[PDB]
Scaffold this motif. Structure first.
Motif, short mmCIF file in Angstrom:
data_model
loop_
_atom_site.label_atom_id
_atom_site.label_comp_id
_atom_site.label_asym_id
_atom_site.label_seq_id
_atom_site.Cartn_x
_atom_site.Cartn_y
_atom_site.Cartn_z
N UNK A 143 26.92 -30.45 -25.39
CA UNK A 143 27.34 -31.60 -24.59
C UNK A 143 28.04 -31.17 -23.30
N UNK A 144 28.94 -30.18 -23.38
CA UNK A 144 29.59 -29.68 -22.17
C UNK A 144 28.56 -29.13 -21.19
N UNK A 145 27.52 -28.48 -21.70
CA UNK A 145 26.46 -28.00 -20.83
C UNK A 145 25.71 -29.15 -20.16
N UNK A 146 25.48 -30.25 -20.88
CA UNK A 146 24.86 -31.41 -20.24
C UNK A 146 25.73 -31.90 -19.09
N UNK A 147 27.04 -32.00 -19.32
CA UNK A 147 27.95 -32.46 -18.28
C UNK A 147 27.86 -31.58 -17.04
#
Length: 373
Positions: free
Chosen positions: A173-177
């Motif tokens: 999820x942090x990578x998506x952000x």
């Protein structure tokens, strides 16, 4: 289904009899391990597309450039795809590879990166089994690489979370952000396809929260419009209702979402439904002129629960083709030449018939017309 897995096993047996490797791969393994019946069963093989066609009487060759051959067998269709990797340049590149693991290590998420042998052995180099058990959507390997290979995967993660009632892995999820801005490179048709799935899938309120929390609503086409309160949204199974619910909640019109390239049919359903929600009172002429799907969708988004089908069904006529008079009747009776005036007068007559005031009878309409004209 009850025949798809069997057919894929038969396809695998045939490929291996000819000396090739072959496996069930991707969503079917996930669904199997979840105790669900696969919707699609893909087969990964060392065979190249033309070698697959040699081994099966009936194939469909659409995706050959991408390494995929659709095999028609026992009344089912099994996609057979050669070990491959893909990457999308920024302006909307397939490599055939020689091993299964080279293919698996570039798939989107661990639960989609498993294979199953003919003898039911699970090949799971990236821990899809444990992520499936823990209900986690986790990018395979380095999430930054997976999302740079295909930015649509960021949105796909959101869709899977609702489809499966899984959470998105924190590092993923942090990578998506961090990579959300890359969604601008994805063809809007692919974005609408994923969003349509979200709109009809379970746990959609959680999906839309991930859409915001992932920073995808910052960068999606008119992405801020998805940040509405979804609590009172309940799918009717038609993704169009999600777009209507999105517009109605914000008092916006269809033009605001036209970037997503709706069909004329979808656009009409939305626009006519929105009109009905702004119409203070519906009467016989409302039910006559609008379609039942439009009345039903407008009722659904405004909370009404009437028996719309019965009201429309009990009108004196259902459509213009039942009208007992046409413009050439009016030409005869008026002695006037054809012109746009005919449409005005046919509609006057149509209204009086739909309100059950004037009988749908040519002679009685004639009497009415000669008096009024």
């Amino acid at each position: 289904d009850d025949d798809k897995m069997n057919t894929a096993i038969k396809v695998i047996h045939t490929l291996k009899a000819a000396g090739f490797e072959a496996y069930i791969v991707g969503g079917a393994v996930r669904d199997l391990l979840l105790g669900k019946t696969p919707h699609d069963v893909d087969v990964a093989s060392s065979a190249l597309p033309q070698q697959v066609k040699v081994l099966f009487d009936r194939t469909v060759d659409t995706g050959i450039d991408h390494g995929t051959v659709l095999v028609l067998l026992d009344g089912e269709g099994i996609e057979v795809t050669t070990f491959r990797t893909e990457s999308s340049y920024s302006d909307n590149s397939v490599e055939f590879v020689l091993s299964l693991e080279e293919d698996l290590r570039r798939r989107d998420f661990t639960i989609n990166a498993m294979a199953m042998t003919e003898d039911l052995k699970i090949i799971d180099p990236f821990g899809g089994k444990e992520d499936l058990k823990n209900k986690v959507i986790r990018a395979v390997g380095d999430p930054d690489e997976r999302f740079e290979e295909d930015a649509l995967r960021m949105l796909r993660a959101i869709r899977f979370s609702g489809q499966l009632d899984f959470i998105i892995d924190m590092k993923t999820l942090l990578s998506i952000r961090r990579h959300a801005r890359l969604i601008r490179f994805i063809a809007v048709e692919r974005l609408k396809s994923e969003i349509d799935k979200i709109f009809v899938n379970p746990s959609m309120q959680k999906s839309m929260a991930y859409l915001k929390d992932s920073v995808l609503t910052r960068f999606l086409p008119v992405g801020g419009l998805f940040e509405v309160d979804w609590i009172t949204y309940h799918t009717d199974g038609n993704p169009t209702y999600g777009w209507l619910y999105l517009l109605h909640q914000q008092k916006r019109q269809f033009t605001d979402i036209k970037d997503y390239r709706f069909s004329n049919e979808e656009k009409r359903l939305i626009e006519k439904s929105l009109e009905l929600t702004a119409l203070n009172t519906w009467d016989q002429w409302t039910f006559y002129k609008y379609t039942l799907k439009q009345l039903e969708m407008a009722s659904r988004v405004t909370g009404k629960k009437k028996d719309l089908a019965a009201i429309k069904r009990q009108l004196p006529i259902q459509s213009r083709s039942e009208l007992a008079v046409d413009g050439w009747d009016l030409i005869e009776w008026s002695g006037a030449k054809s012109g746009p005036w005919l449409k005005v007068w046919i509609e006057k007559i149509e209204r009086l018939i739909v309100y059950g005031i004037l009988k749908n009878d040519k002679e009685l309409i004639k009497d009415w017309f000669e008096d009024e004209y």
